[PDB]
Amino acid sequence: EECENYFSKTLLDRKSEKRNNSDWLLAKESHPATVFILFSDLNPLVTLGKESFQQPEVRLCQLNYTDIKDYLAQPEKITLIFLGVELEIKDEDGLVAWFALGIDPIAAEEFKQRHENCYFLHPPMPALLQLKEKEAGVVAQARSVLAWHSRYKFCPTCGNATKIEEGGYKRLCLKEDCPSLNGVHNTSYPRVDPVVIMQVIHPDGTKCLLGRQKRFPPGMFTCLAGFIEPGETIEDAVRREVEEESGVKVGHVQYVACQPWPMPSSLMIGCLALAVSTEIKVDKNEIEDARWFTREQVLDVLTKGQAFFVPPSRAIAHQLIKHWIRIN
Amino acid sequence: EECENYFSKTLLDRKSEKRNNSDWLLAKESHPATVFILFSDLNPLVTLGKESFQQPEVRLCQLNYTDIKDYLAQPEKITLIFLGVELEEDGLVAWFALGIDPIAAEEFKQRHENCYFLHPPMPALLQLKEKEAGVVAQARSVLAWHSRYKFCPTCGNATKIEEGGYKRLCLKEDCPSLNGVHNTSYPRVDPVVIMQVIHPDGTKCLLGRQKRFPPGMFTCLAGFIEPGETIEDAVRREVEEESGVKVGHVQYVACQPWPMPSSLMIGCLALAVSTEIKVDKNEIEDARWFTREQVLDVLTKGQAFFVPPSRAIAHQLIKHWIRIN
Ligand SMILES: C[n+]1cn([C@@H]2O[C@H](COP(=O)(O)OP(=O)(O)OP(=O)(O)O)[C@@H](O)[C@H]2O)c2nc(N)[nH]c(=O)c21
Ligand SMILES: C[n+]1cn([C@@H]2O[C@H](COP(=O)(O)OP(=O)(O)OP(=O)(O)O)[C@@H](O)[C@H]2O)c2nc(N)[nH]c(=O)c21
Alpha-carbon B23 to chain mean position: 31
Neighbouring residues of A119: CB distance < 8 A, sequence distance ≥ 6: A45, A46, A47, A112
Q: Do A151 and B176 touch (CB under 8 A)?
A: yes
Give A56's strand partners. none
Q: How far is CA B228 from CA A269, B132, B277, in A?
A: 13, 34, 27
Given CB atoms, is A199 within the 8 Å cutoff of chain B?
Answer: no
Residue in A157, A179, A258 nearest the CB of B230: A258
Distances (CA, A) of B83 to A173, B40, B42, B97: 32, 17, 15, 7
Residue B246 DSSP one-character state: P
- Report the 10 Å Cβ neighbour count for A10: 26
| Nearest-CA residue for atom 13 of ligand 2 | B223
Q: Is B12-185 in CATH node 3.30.70.1520?
A: no
Question: Longest C-alpha distance within chain B, in Å?
Answer: 66
A256 contact partners, CB below 8 Å, separation of at least 6: A199, A270, A271, A272, A320, A323
Domain A12-188: CATH class, spelled out: alpha beta
Chain B residue with Cα closest to A245: B17
Question: What are residue A286's phi and psi, to 5 degrees?
Answer: -125, -35
Residues preceding chain discontinuities in chain B with C to N over 2.5 Å:
49, 88, 302
- Residue limits of CATH 3.90.79.20 in chain B: 12-185
CA distance B94 to A234: 24
Query: A-chain residues within 8 Å CB-CB of B184?
Result: 151-152
- The class (CATH top level) of B190-324 is alpha beta
Asked if B159 and B149 touch (Cβ cutoff 8 Å), the reply is yes
Q: How far apart are CA A29 and CA A78, in angstroms?
A: 14
Strands B190-198 and B263-272: parallel
Establish if A130 touches chain B: CB-CB under 8 angstroms.
no
How many C-alpha atoms does B236 have within 13 Å on its Cβ side? Answer: 17
Q: How far apart are CA B54 and CA A223, in angstroms?
A: 51
Resolution to 1 decimal place, in Å: 2.9
**Nearest-CA residue for atom 1 of ligand 2:** A186
The protein residue whose alpha carbon is closest to atom 27 in ligand 2 is A184
Contact A15, A140 (CB under 8 A): no
* Single-letter residue type at A225: A
CB atoms within 10 A of CB A300: 16
Strand pairing report for A207-212 and A193-201: antiparallel
Listed in sequence order, the residues at least 6 apart from B180 whose beta carbon sits closer than 8 Å to its beta carbon are none
> Contact A237/A196 with Cβ under 8 angstroms?
yes
Question: How was this structure obtained?
Answer: X-ray
Among residues A24, A158, B44, A311, which one has the least CA distance to residue A320?
A311
Rounded distance, CA B124 to CA B45, Å? 12
Distance of alpha carbon B312 from the chain centroid = 11
User: Residues A313, A318, A324, A326: what is their CA dihedral angle, to the nearest 10 degrees?
Assistant: -10
B41: Cβ–Cβ under 8 A, 6 or more apart, which residues? B102, B105, B119
CB A292 within 8 A of CB A202: yes
Interface contact flag, B138 A229, Cβ < 8 Å:
yes
Instruction: Count other C-beta atoms under 10 Å from residue B194's C-beta.
Output: 24
Contact assessment for residue B224 and residue B190, using Cβ atoms and an 8 Å cutoff: yes
By Cβ distance, the residue of A1, A145, A186 closest to B227 is: A145
Helix residue ranges per DSSP H, chain B: 22-30, 65-72, 102-112, 121-124, 130-148, 231-242, 292-299, 313-324
Cβ of residue B223 closer than 8 Å to a chain A Cβ: no
CA distance A158 to A171: 14
Query: Where are the alpha helices (H) located in chain A, listed in sequence order?
Result: 22-30, 65-72, 105-115, 124-127, 133-151, 234-245, 295-302, 316-327
The DSSP call for residue A279 is -
Domain with CATH 3.90.79.20 in chain A: 12-188
C-alpha closest to that of A271 among A225, A203, A210, A216: A225
Q: Where in chain A is the domain with CATH 3.90.79.10?
A: 193-327
Burial class, B272, CB count within 10 angstroms (exposed 0-12 / middle 13-18 / buried 19+): buried
CA B131 to centroid of ligand 1, rounded, Å: 29
Task: Say if residues A186 and B188 touch (Cβ distance below 8 Å).
Answer: yes
How far is it, in rounded angstroms, from Cα A78 to Cα A81?
Answer: 10
Nearest to B40 by CA among B108, B94, B91: B108
Contacts of B241 in chain A (CB under 8 A): 16-17
Instruction: For A147-214, give the DSSP string.
Output: HHHHH--B-TTT--BEEEETTTTEEEE--TT-GGGSS--TTSSPP-EEEEEEEEEPTTSSEEEEEE-S
Round to whole Å and give the CA distance between A228 and B298.
35
* Cβ-count burial B104-118 (b if 16+ within 10 Å, e if not): ebeebeeeeeebebb
Find out whether A118 and A112 touch, Cβ atoms under 8 Å.
Answer: yes
| B307 secondary structure, DSSP code | -
Q: Which of A227, A267, A269, A284 should be mutated for ligand 1, with most atoms under 8 A from CB? A: A227
Q: Please list every residue in chain B whose beta carbon sits closer than 8 Å to the beta carbon of residue A252.
A: 1
State how far the Cα of B266 lies from the Cα of B189, in Å rounded to an integer: 12
What's phi and psi for A127, nearest 5 deg? -45, -40
CB-based contact, B244 to chain A, within 8 Å: no
End-to-end CA distance of chain A: 20
- Going by C-beta distance under 8 Å and a sequence separation of 6 or more, which residues neighbour residue A306? A297, A300
How far apart, in whole angstroms, are the C-alpha atoms of residue B11 and residue B13?
7
Could you say which ligand is closest to the alpha carbon of residue B187? 1
A44 CB-near residues (< 8 Å, 6+ apart)? A37, A38, A60, A120, A121, A139, A142, A143
Return the C-alpha torsion angle B12, B16, B20, B26, nearest 10: 0
Nearest of B283, B309, B307 to residue B297 by alpha carbon = B307
The fold of the A193-327 domain, in CATH, is Nucleoside Triphosphate Pyrophosphohydrolase (3.90.79)
- CATH 3.90.79.10 domain span(s) along chain B: 190-324
With a CB cutoff of 8 Å and minimum separation 6, the contacts of B285 are B208, B209, B210, B211, B213, B279
C-beta separation of B78 from B102 below 8 A: no
- Other C-beta atoms lying within 10 Å of the C-beta of residue B309: 11
